[PDB]
């Protein structure tokens, strides 16, 4: 169960629709799903410590966290949040997010490995879920 690698996206389901129900305007949705916005995800895992860099043709962001320790990131629609990841199993982590300011949808995400070595990401806002699948280069 090692999440490290250079992960390339191979499936995406319900992402634009999730943004739509969050109130994201149509220009930004279409951009978010364009080929040019396809995420490449680099992960370095060392036990419970993660470094994850997500890059597209125009953006790059890095997060560093340790499982069980609170950190700060942004929600699917860009609002700052405090996050905390826990293991649900040997091969799956789950993250609960809490907005830093104001109120909003209950948001969370998960990452898990398949035995064939696919990485599955889900992101949830209230009752709406999006799933992306990646494979290693």
UniProtKB/Swiss-Prot annotation:
Primary residence? cytoplasm
The short sequence motif called Nuclear localization signal sits at 20-30
Protein name (database record): Cellular retinoic acid-binding protein 2
Alphabetically list the UniProt keywords. Answer: Cytoplasm, Endoplasmic reticulum, Isopeptide bond, Nucleus, Retinol-binding, Transport, Ubl conjugation, Vitamin A
The entry assigns this protein to a family as follows: Belongs to the calycin superfamily. Fatty-acid binding protein (FABP) family.
Impact reported for residue 29 to A: Loss of ligand-induced nuclear import
Q: Which GO terms describe its cellular component?
A: cytoplasm; cytosol; endoplasmic reticulum; extracellular exosome; nucleoplasm; nucleus
The gene name reads: CRABP2
- Localization per Swiss-Prot or TrEMBL: Cytoplasm; Endoplasmic reticulum; Nucleus
Crosslink Glycyl lysine isopeptide (Lys-Gly) (interchain with G-Cter in SUMO) sits at which residues?
Answer: 101
Query: Which domain of life does the protein's organism represent?
Result: Eukaryota
User: Quick check: keyword Secreted in the entry?
Assistant: no
Role played = Transports retinoic acid to the nucleus. Regulates the access of retinoic acid to the nuclear retinoic acid receptors.
- Protein source organism: Homo sapiens
Q: Where does this protein hold all-trans-retinoate?
A: 132-134
| Written domain comment of the UniProt record | Forms a beta-barrel structure that accommodates hydrophobic ligands in its interior.
Q: What induces it?
A: By retinoic acid.
The molecular function terms of the Gene Ontology recorded here are: cyclin binding; fatty acid binding; retinal binding; retinoic acid binding; retinoid binding; retinol binding
Gene Ontology biological-process annotations: embryonic forelimb morphogenesis; epidermis development; fatty acid transport; positive regulation of collateral sprouting; regulation of DNA-templated transcription; retinoic acid metabolic process; signal transduction
Please describe the post-translational modifications of this protein: Sumoylated in response to retinoic acid binding, sumoylation is critical for dissociation from ER and subsequent nuclear translocation.
Q: Which InterPro entries match?
A: Calycin, Fatty_acid-bd, ILBP, Lipocln_cytosolic_FA-bd_dom
- Summary of subunit composition and partner proteins: Interacts with RXR and RARA. Interacts with importin alpha.
> Can the keyword Transferase be found in this entry's annotation?
no
Lineage of source species? Eukaryota, Metazoa, Chordata, Craniata, Vertebrata
Q: Which Gene3D superfamilies match?
A: 2.40.128.20
